[PDB]
Design a protein around this nucleic acid. Structure first.
Lengths: 136, 118, 175, 112, 44, 50
RNA sequence: CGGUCGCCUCCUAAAAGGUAACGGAGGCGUACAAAGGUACCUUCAGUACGGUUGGAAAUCGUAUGUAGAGUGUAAUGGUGU
RNA sequence: UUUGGUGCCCAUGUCGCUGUGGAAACACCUGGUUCCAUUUCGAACCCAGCAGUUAAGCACAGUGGAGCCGAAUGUAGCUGCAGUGAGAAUAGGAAAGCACCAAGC
RNA sequence: UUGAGGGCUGCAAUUCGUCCUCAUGAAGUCGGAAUCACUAGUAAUCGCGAAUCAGCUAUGUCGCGGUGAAUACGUUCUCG
């Protein structure tokens, strides 16, 4: 899906997925921002679903920027495997999201549509959502 | 300009080696000056070489003739006409009919197939 | 001597024309370099010795050939395989080469349409390319079959090349 | 890149670094500079980083070849009672007047 | 050390002038059809 | 895996001094070294052998 | 049944070191009378510019360029007179 | 007092600009039979002389142009729910300095 | 072939006339299968006239005249 077309190493480390935030502690481009209240990994399927839903309910009248991206890939060995004999096999690409980070910032449309879109995207993402309003 | 001569043969034909000056002006100048070109020798001396070249430059210069023909062709092709498009695509302009003739500018004969019939 | 006339007249003329308050701000030509480049045979058309020998004959300095600084992809040329020649000359040989060029080379050109409009790099360097092997007063017609041109460059102690144009104009240069 | 003088400074620096590092014996280095008008010589003993002796053609002579500019400082060396120096060529080559001053140092029984 | 060098005169009879710093080392006072004094872009 | 061995030995007493290597591909030529010799107790030219 | 059985570089591997798998990666059964030692002197890769053959890349000239070549080589570290 | 060299320290030392002066010196410069020499040449090295030079490099004053260093709070991190102290950003700094000899003091 | 200048035809020459002069001189150093022609003025070859006619690179056609060959053993194989 939406992922780098090249990568030097097939098998990276899992993720150092604990912690609160490493950058992106603020809304930058949009007017309403989504805040994650859980740190885990999100696959590209849900990300694509949320992006399509947001583009459907918003269009190009406004604009929403995504501050995260599936920079990582993951491996998962198939069933009926005896422990050992090499590592697993790559399956997909994933994005780590830490509790207290921003990933969607939307602007150029009234506030109610922003709130509705953020609620719909949050109910599409596994992570529990929080809303933030941009201020200068 | 001063070095285009075959070795050890008549100067009157040796002068025509330049791309743009033929046997007419060369012989006309030569017999007007009455130099009596030598037989089977590349050249006699250079006492008149500069003079012969100065006199020949009066007619025209072959290298300058290259530019003259180039600008003539360019100006002929710039103006919207059958001549310009005909010369642009390198085809015979003089009106001769062409079916499979005039095979000097079209390169080698090139064909693949045609319409068959049973 | 062209060099004597230069150093006795042109330096003072340029000092009077361009205010310097110092007799050594006038641009002075340092050296000339000659190189050809060979790309007709893999390692031997005439073994390149013809051009080296004629340059040796025409110049007072021994010719030398450069090595392959870069790996060549078009042809199998790596780690040497000398192509072209290199001669860096100064002193009286420089002036001899200059006077051959200003009175024989350009006059021996079949047709000329002027020069010295943009032959600069913007940093005080000038260049001349010649398309004929037999253009010099010292060259034999019997040589390598293919006629070969040459490239030379001129540089001074400064980079204000406008004054170089003015000086060369004072030294028999087409405009 | 090269001013014909700063490159001399760098060459002299690398030579004295070589002397300092490769030679671990306590010895004063006789550094000689070949100026375009005359020649100067100085002495530098490490572990103190000061000058022990010096000579040139300003306070002792007028111009250059003359070997005198050696003996005096050579005398200065025997006035220091060490006579064990390492001869630095500086930004020059051992030849001509450099060899002349080396011979002048040798004839005074200096160890180098 | 090098090829035997020398100094020979040059002569442009077309422009009727002679100059001398160096020339070909095996011939004396070679002749040319045109020089820098008869240059087509310097004569008024 | 490769065999480059050659034995440099003295000539005045025919010793077997030093085992060394030299590429036969570049040149199959004898190399005359100058090294120390015990039975001569001095630096002499050693020659190569199989 | 399959893979390996020895040697060496990096991460795993807990800021010395040490430290597992049928972990992730990689190379090895070398080369060399020169790619050795010593003395001499010399210092980038590249980019832009200007040039007959002559290419995005041939060589030179002018600079800028501070590590982005090279120091046999799979890798590491160091390596800018 | 400065100038010349020198190591020391290898940027808060750098690369750049505006002016200053070289009379003694340093530098350029004058040339290349010869000491020596050019991967190729008085390019470079080297010989013997200072006609001219403050223009080139050398420096001194300014230039915060670029490069570069970097205050505190808070904060990341952690050792038992307190301590510990960050980095980055930020005020800003930023036109080297320390010794020896030598000439004019 | 390309380009320039003169001259002619016809009301008119760009589509598409022609001639001359001048500038250039593509290829080609006898061509593979197939093969046409004629038994003496013959082949081959050097020229001229008529036609269509304002113009007509038709080297075409109809003729004219000059110079002037080779072989023929054969009908077995090729065609009728």
């Amino acid at each position: 899906m939406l992922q780098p077309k090249r990568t030097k190493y097939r098998k990276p480390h899992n993720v150092s997925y604990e912690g609160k935030a490493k950058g992106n502690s603020y809304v930058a481009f949009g007017e309403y921002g989504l805040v994650a209240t859980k740190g885990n990994w999100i696959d590209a399927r849900a990300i694509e679903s949320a992006r399509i839903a947001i583009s459907k309910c918003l269009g190009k009248t406004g604009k929403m920027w995504i501050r995260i991206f599936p920079h990582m890939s993951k491996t998962k060995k198939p069933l009926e495997v005896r422990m050992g004999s090499g590592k697993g096999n790559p399956e997909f690409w994933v994005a780590v999201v830490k509790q207290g980070t921003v990933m969607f910032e939307v602007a150029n449309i009234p506030e109610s549509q922003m709130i509705k879109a953020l609620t719909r995207a949050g109910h599409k993402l596994p992570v529990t959502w929080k809303i933030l309003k941009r201020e200068e | 300009l001063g070095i285009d001569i075959p070795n050890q043969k008549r100067i009157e034909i040796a002068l025509t080696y330049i791309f743009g000056i033929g046997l007419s002006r060369s012989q006309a100048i030569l017999k007007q000056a009455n130099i009596n070109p030598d037989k089977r020798v590349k050249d006699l001396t250079e006492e008149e070489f500069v003079a012969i070249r100065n006199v020949a430059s009066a007619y025209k210069i072959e290298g300058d003739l290259r530019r003259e023909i180039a600008l003539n062709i360019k100006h002929l092709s710039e103006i919207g006409a059958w001549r310009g498009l005909r010369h642009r695509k390198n085809l015979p302009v003089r009106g001769q009919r062409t079916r499979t003739n005039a095979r000097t500018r079209k390169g080698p004969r090139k064909t693949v197939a045609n319409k068959k019939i049973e | 001597n062209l060099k004597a006339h230069y150093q006795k007249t042109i330096a003072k003329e340029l000092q009077k024309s361009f205010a310097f308050s110092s007799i050594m701000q006038v641009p002075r030509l340092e050296k000339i370099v000659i190189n050809m480049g060979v790309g007709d045979a893999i390692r031997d058309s005439k073994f390149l010795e013809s051009a080296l020998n004629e340059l040796h004959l025409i110049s007072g300095q021994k010719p030398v050939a450069t090595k392959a600084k870069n790996a060549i992809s078009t042809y199998k040329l790596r780690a040497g395989q000398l192509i072209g020649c290199k001669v860096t000359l100064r002193g009286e040989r420089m002036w001899a080469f200059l006077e051959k060029l200003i009175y024989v080379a350009l006059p021996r050109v079949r047709d000329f349409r002027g020069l010295s409009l943009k032959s600069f790099d913007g940093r005080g360097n000038y260049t001349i390319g010649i398309k004929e092997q037999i253009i010099f007063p010292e060259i034999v017609y019997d040589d390598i079959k293919r006629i070969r041109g040459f490239d030379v460059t001129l540089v001074t102690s400064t980079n204000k090349d406008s004054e170089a144009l003015a000086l060369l104009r004072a030294l028999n240069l087409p405009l | 890149m090269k001013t014909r003088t700063e490159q001399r400074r760098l060459r002299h620096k690398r030579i004295v670094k070589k002397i300092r590092a490769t030679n671990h014996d306590n010895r004063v280095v006789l550094m000689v500079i070949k100026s375009l008008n005359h020649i100067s010589v100085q002495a530098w003993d490490f572990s103190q980083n000061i000058v022990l002796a010096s000579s040139s053609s300003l306070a002792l002579k007028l111009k250059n070849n003359a070997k005198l500019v050696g003996q005096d400082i050579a005398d200065k060396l025997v006035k220091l009672k060490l006579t064990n120096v390492v001869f630095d060529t500086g930004g020059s080559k051992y030849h001509g007047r450099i060899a002349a001053l080396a011979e002048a140092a040798r004839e005074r029984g200096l160890n180098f | 050390f090098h090829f035997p060098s020398q100094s020979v005169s040059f002569k442009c009879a077309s422009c009727s002038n002679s100059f001398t710093i160096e020339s070909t080392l095996k011939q004396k006072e070679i002749t040319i059809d045109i020089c820098g004094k008869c240059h087509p872009f310097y004569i008024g | 895996a490769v065999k480059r061995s050659t034995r440099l030995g003295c000539n005045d007493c025919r010793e077997i001094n030093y085992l060394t290597f030299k590429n036969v591909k570049k040149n199959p030529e004898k190399l005359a070294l100058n090294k120390f010799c015990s039975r001569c107790r001095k630096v002499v030219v050693h020659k190569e052998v199989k």
